[PDB]
Each structure stands twice: as C-alpha cells, then as structure tokens.
C-alpha cells in the first residue's frame, strides 16, 4: 500500500485525473467492444 502511491500514483495523478479523462471513456468503449466480440464466439 506504500510506494505504490508514492512512486506510482503521485506523478501520474495530473494525467490520470485531468488529462486522461476521455481516455478512460474510450477505454470503457473499448472494453465494451471487446466483451461483445469475445461474447459473439
């Protein structure tokens, strides 16, 4: 629970929170697409 937030999350907070929002929306879209694909098999 430590260092995972000290060297991994505090430098990526400005990106994961503010810059990559629509990136996460797109990742949700991609996950739905992949679920539907692997399901239709």
């Amino acid at each position: 629970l430590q260092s995972i937030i000290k060297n991994i999350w505090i430098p990526m907070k400005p990106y994961y929170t503010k810059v990559y929002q629509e990136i996460w929306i797109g990742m949700g879209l991609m996950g739905f697409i992949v679920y539907k694909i692997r399901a239709a098999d």
Partner: protein
C-alpha cells in the same frame, strides 16, 4: 505451421506474453545526473528530437498530451525493433494490442473535442465552403469517415508488421529450399533477404512514427 510466430506464446504452461510486452521499458534507463553515460545521452537526445517533431504543431491544450504521445512512439518503436530479432514474438502483430492502443486514444480525443469545442466539433463534420445542394449526405461521408478512423489506425499497424514479418519468413524458407540446389541462386536470394531486412527496419520505425502522428492529428483537430 506458418502463423506459428504469431501464435500466443507460452513457456512451461505459463503465459509468457506478459514478460514480452512489459520488457521494452526495461531498455530505457533513467538518471538524475547531469553528465551521464552514452546510452542515456543518446536516448535523451532522441526523445528531445521526437518531442520537438511531434508536439511543436499544437497549442497548449494539445501539448498537454506530450508525455502520452512520446511514450506511445517510444513504446511502439521499441516493440517493432525488438520484433526483428530471430524467433521473437512481436506483440504488435496482434490485433488485440493494436485495437487497445487505437480505440482509447482516438475515442478520447474525439470526446475531448466534444466536451469543449462542441459547436466547432459538430461543425467540422462538414467542410463549410461546400455548396448547398448536397451538404447533407456529404456529412454522411464525414460521419462514416470519422467512425472508420480508429479501426484503420489499429489495422494500419497490425498488417504492416504481420505481413512484413511473414514476408521475410518466406524468403528464409526460399533460400533454405535453394540451399541445396544452386549456390549462386542461394546467394542472390540471400541478398534479396538482406535488402528486405533493411527495409523492415525502416518500416518498423516509420509505422511507429505514423501511428503517433495520426493520433496527434486527431488531437490537433479536436483541440
């Protein structure tokens, strides 16, 4: 028997695609020093140059993605250039990884243009200088065009590695087949193979840079 090099790898029953995909970063060491070794010297020069190339053409809201775009090009280029080693599983040849690199970024930049930029974004769906009588289905083109952007991206890589690899592979076969028949024909096929390998190096680098640049253009159009 032929697509074996693209079959998902495994060792001792374990999924060794993990160790393959996570390795390229291990080739970029970092340091806090000011005068460091030759490796990090050249690598920082290359990243400086690549950043100057990619991100210059953006406003600030675009330049926020500098980390993302440079990490993208570095990851893809190292993966491709690690693909050229013998008996190596190139994880870009997979459609999965490329779809997962393509749909997020493109969808993100389109939605970013939609959150802000909203009138601008719904207007760029149409070239404005267009005359009236078929403005309507013209935008149908554009809309369709838009939704083909991501797939294309992924596809645009998945082949030009896959194909490329197969390509070299087969000439290998060929020269091996001619290894026992006509020595000079073997030599000239070997020379074809050499020139081919050089072309493959170049096309690996180019495809990395191209994926990056196209995502960059979508960004700049949606900021």
């Amino acid at each position: 028997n032929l697509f074996a090099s693209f079959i998902a790898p495994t060792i001792l029953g374990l999924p060794a695609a993990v160790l393959i995909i996570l390795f390229p970063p291990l080739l970029i060491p970092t340091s806090k020093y000011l005068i460091n070794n030759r490796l990090i010297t050249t690598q920082q020069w290359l990243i400086k140059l690549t950043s100057k190339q990619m991100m210059t053409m953006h406003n600030t809201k675009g330049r926020t993605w500098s980390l993302m775009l440079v990490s993208l090009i570095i990851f893809i280029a190292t993966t491709n250039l690690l693909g050229l080693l013998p008996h190596s599983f190139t994880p870009t040849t997979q459609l999965s990884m490329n779809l997962a690199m393509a749909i997020p970024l493109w969808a993100g930049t389109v939605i970013m243009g939609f959150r802000s930029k909203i009138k601008n974004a719904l207007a760029h769906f149409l070239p404005q200088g267009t005359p009236t009588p078929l403005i309507p289905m013209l935008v149908i083109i554009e809309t369709i065009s838009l939704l083909i952007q991501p797939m294309a991206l992924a596809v645009r890589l998945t082949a030009n590695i896959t194909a490329g690899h197969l390509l070299m592979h087969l000439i290998g076969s060929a020269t091996l087949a001619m290894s026992t028949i006509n020595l000079p024909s073997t030599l000239i096929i070997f020379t074809i193979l050499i020139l081919l390998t050089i072309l493959e190096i170049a096309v690996a680098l180019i495809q990395a840079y191209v994926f990056t640049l196209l995502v960059s253009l979508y960004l700049h159009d949606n900021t």
